[PDB]
Amino acid sequence: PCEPESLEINKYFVVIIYALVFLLSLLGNSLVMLVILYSRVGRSVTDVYLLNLALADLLFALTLPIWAASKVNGWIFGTFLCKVVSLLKEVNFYSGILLLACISVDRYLAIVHATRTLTQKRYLVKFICLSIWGLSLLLALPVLLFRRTVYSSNVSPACYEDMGNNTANWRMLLRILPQSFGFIVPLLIMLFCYGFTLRTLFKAHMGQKHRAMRVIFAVVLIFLLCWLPYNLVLLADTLMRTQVIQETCERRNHIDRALDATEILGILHSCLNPLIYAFIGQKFRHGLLKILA
Amino acid sequence: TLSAEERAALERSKAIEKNLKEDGISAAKDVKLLLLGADNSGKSTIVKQMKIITGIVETHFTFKNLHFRLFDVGGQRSERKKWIHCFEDVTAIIFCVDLSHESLMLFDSICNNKFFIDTSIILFLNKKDLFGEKIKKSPLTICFPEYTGPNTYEDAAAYIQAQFESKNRSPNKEIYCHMTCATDTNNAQVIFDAVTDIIIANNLRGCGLY
Amino acid sequence: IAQARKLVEQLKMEANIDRIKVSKAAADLMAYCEAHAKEDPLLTPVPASENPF
Amino acid sequence: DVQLVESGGGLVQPGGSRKLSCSASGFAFSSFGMHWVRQAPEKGLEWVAYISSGSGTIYYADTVKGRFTISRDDPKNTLFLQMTSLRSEDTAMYYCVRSIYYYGSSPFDFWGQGTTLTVSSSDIVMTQATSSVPVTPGESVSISCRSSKSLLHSNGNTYLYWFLQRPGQSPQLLIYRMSNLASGVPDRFSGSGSGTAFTLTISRLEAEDVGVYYCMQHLEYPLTFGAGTKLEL
Amino acid sequence: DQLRQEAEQLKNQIRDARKACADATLSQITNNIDPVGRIQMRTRRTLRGHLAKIYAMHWGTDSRLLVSASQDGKLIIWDSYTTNKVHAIPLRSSWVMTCAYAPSGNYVACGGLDNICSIYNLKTREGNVRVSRELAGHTGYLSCCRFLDDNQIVTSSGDTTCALWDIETGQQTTTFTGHTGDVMSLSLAPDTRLFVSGACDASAKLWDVREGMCRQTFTGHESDINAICFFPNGNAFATGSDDATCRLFDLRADQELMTYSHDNIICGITSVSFSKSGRLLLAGYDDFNCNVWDALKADRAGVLAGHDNRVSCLGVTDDGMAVATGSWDSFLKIWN
């Protein structure tokens, strides 16, 4: 038999990084919402998108410490807390990714189709935000319905899934949603929109084109760096459970550790969203400086 | 709303609101530009597709499925500080300068005005042929005694352009330059490129990219 | 020479005005502002039963 | 000149279908809500149908609900009325009336010339006390009619309308809420009322003032007219 | 040459007499009144529908109907109680700076940068609003149209002159001259026989509508006067300039009585209005809010605020029941 191994150094590293991420995200999205909601002068659509994104990241940071305690000692908090925390986390993850996609769509329609009348169609931010929240909740409903504490003699209890005796293949089936409506479609949308926006900027004669391209490239690179390794590890795990790739205990341990590492790396999206989306523009810095008085 | 007549009044108000919204939707396709410059500088003879329509003069030529409305503020002969804020929302300023000091004075006044700190300026230098014929007869030194470079056409034109751009002294503003003659027809295309560039920059600023 | 002739005549017209001490005028303004004080829905808030807005 | 002229009347057999067209010329037709009012022979006025501006809100009388159809042709400046089945009780002189509603408008000012239609063989009740009043010129006359409910709405406006019909002519509006004089009528008219009892007084009556006086309520549909008081000389 | 010295000695005599008539300031004589305290006004209505900056607004005599012109070329008549649009009149020129509402409610004039005062008829037999007359004869932008009656209207222009018209004939009946700068605002006296105009030369002078003579002139402002309103009893008026100050001039005393300057105020006053009693002097600034000045002690008795852009027009109903403010964010707010 193969014995799953672990180290206390890894747990300490995970919890310290989780606490740091929680504090940073809390502070950043607190400043974002404060700056947005203090003064209603010029409530542009970008402000609405940034407020929604900061709210999603703030609630995600709110749920983070419970997951840190779970990594400390498994899920000893009960089934109801498992359902609530997992549902909230999945809803926030879906909402954040879809909000990034919608922001990219807005930028594409604002810079490429700028002179045409297509720009009149982006004043529906409240409707699309409500649709995004609803679709995220619907997609994360299976988490609420089919998650419960699972006990084992050799494995510490965790907020896992339970739908039958053959739950492994059902987990593999359920994984197809977060990797398709969570990474594939948003990546395609962002790539298309930002590629066309870069083409439009490239053939123009402003004096501030270079900063725009730099910001766009930074956003795309940060999104990729944050979320690609997690999806790659999950795809490798699904390949292992399908027996396509040869399975060994060392491989199981390697993927088990890499999954936690990639999850920690990808959680940094809530930390890096403020400095990349809001504070990178002069308007928000000016607003914060004005608020400081 | 309880009464029948009040219900009919509410229906009339809703119909008026719908008409207002439709008129506002139809009023966003056009582009509002401001014309400025010294007298006899060709400020009314930029595009041959004029289609005009004492006071304010409007010109509403169209190009590439986009409507440009040029408000010529000439003839008012009043204090600009009291009505120039009526044009705060213009997309750009079209400045026409005839090369054949007052024009520099207007340009300095209009560029540093508090209302137009963020409105870009499209600068048109008219009458290339007249300037090139006049410079040979009289060197560009009577009006610009500080000139030191060669008396050729290109260097003199670049020097005038440099002194016109030196009055910018402001961020978030770009000056788009073009040299025009009497027998030029592509002014509409140049205006379209300048306006679309200005719109791109404004959208960039709004989106938070810059 | 023909433009300033009317200005001095205007000054003659403006100079001969029956002026009144500012104390009496201020007293009259105070008297009006105190007499017509019960009919101001802004200085004294109106009861909510008699507020059409 | 504002003019409403309508055609389509005539003798029809029971069970047939007839369409009446009210053509308007002299005002902004698209901004006026239009009614249809029928007057039975020597019986009195009665409301039939109403279509709002832009064909938004349409109402019908309970007598002919689901049987008549009213349509509006804004570009053509024409108002129609399609009737499916006609009984012997539908024979009457049909009038076309314009009505514009906003704060301070006169919603029954102009009436059509009337078209005659012949067929071969809960609600607010307004009652007029007297059917015929003889009087000599120069003597003030008092006309009063009651209502079942209190027409005095919560906003302080009472919806009572007084109409005048000279012999052989079409009704004309005199007062539209309580004393608000219509446009062009002599100032000798004056109206009053309180809740349910209303009175119309005419000081220094003239010889051209004789006719039938109708009082109508506009508080809630269907609109109901009074019996009709006739002045005799 | 001698005329210049004659004018100088005339001005010296006028100033000497004016200073001789002054004994005590208003702020000193009335120092014994109890302060009005804090006057808190809450937004009761918010009139939306305009799609551009609003420059002017006027209240109906019945204190229920409004009128407002904006850059969109629309002239909207509101129902201030239920927030309904009674009328929507489309202007020929989108550049309009001055609404005016007739005292009888029959007409509404609306002119601006296009140099003519268009007059509209509301009570027509055809059911629509038609331009009854278009008054021309001014060489500069128009400002502060005011109705004397249904066939008599007073206008102010940038031609450094004010004119009294006759709507029936359409001709300039009387012309008032004497200003040396653009005339920006005027207000008609309640007695309806005198009016004062505020020009760009930092001076407001009282006029007579019957004789066309400049009875009086007032000085003291450091910049161009932007708005004027009469005191309710027709014996004083308050002016607002870009100097960020308001002043109270009295017709009988010929002197300013007190100043309404605050150290924190930097931008000038756009519109000036009084209350029915004459105690609150409401003034609109360029810093997006209005400050209510107690007209007898020069203390800020509250702040309206609430607007996103510059307040361009103020209006107090005839009964004093409400104060309505219009700004450049295409929103009108009614306060009480």
Short mmCIF file of C-alpha atoms in Angstrom, two decimals, chain C residues 5-6 8 12 17 21 23 26-27 30 35 37 41 43-44 46 48 52:
data_model
loop_
_atom_site.label_atom_id
_atom_site.label_comp_id
_atom_site.label_asym_id
_atom_site.label_seq_id
_atom_site.Cartn_x
_atom_site.Cartn_y
_atom_site.Cartn_z
CA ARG C 5 -21.24 114.98 -22.61
CA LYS C 6 -23.99 112.56 -21.55
CA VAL C 8 -21.74 114.28 -16.74
CA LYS C 12 -26.04 115.34 -12.33
CA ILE C 17 -31.39 112.03 -4.96
CA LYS C 21 -29.93 107.65 6.73
CA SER C 23 -30.11 103.51 10.21
CA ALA C 26 -31.96 99.12 8.07
CA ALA C 27 -34.71 99.56 10.66
CA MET C 30 -35.71 94.67 9.95
CA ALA C 35 -43.45 91.38 10.52
CA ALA C 37 -41.95 86.13 9.50
CA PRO C 41 -42.17 77.91 5.13
CA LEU C 43 -37.33 80.02 8.03
CA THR C 44 -39.76 78.01 10.18
CA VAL C 46 -43.92 73.70 8.03
CA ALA C 48 -45.77 67.65 7.54
CA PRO C 52 -47.18 69.48 -0.54
#
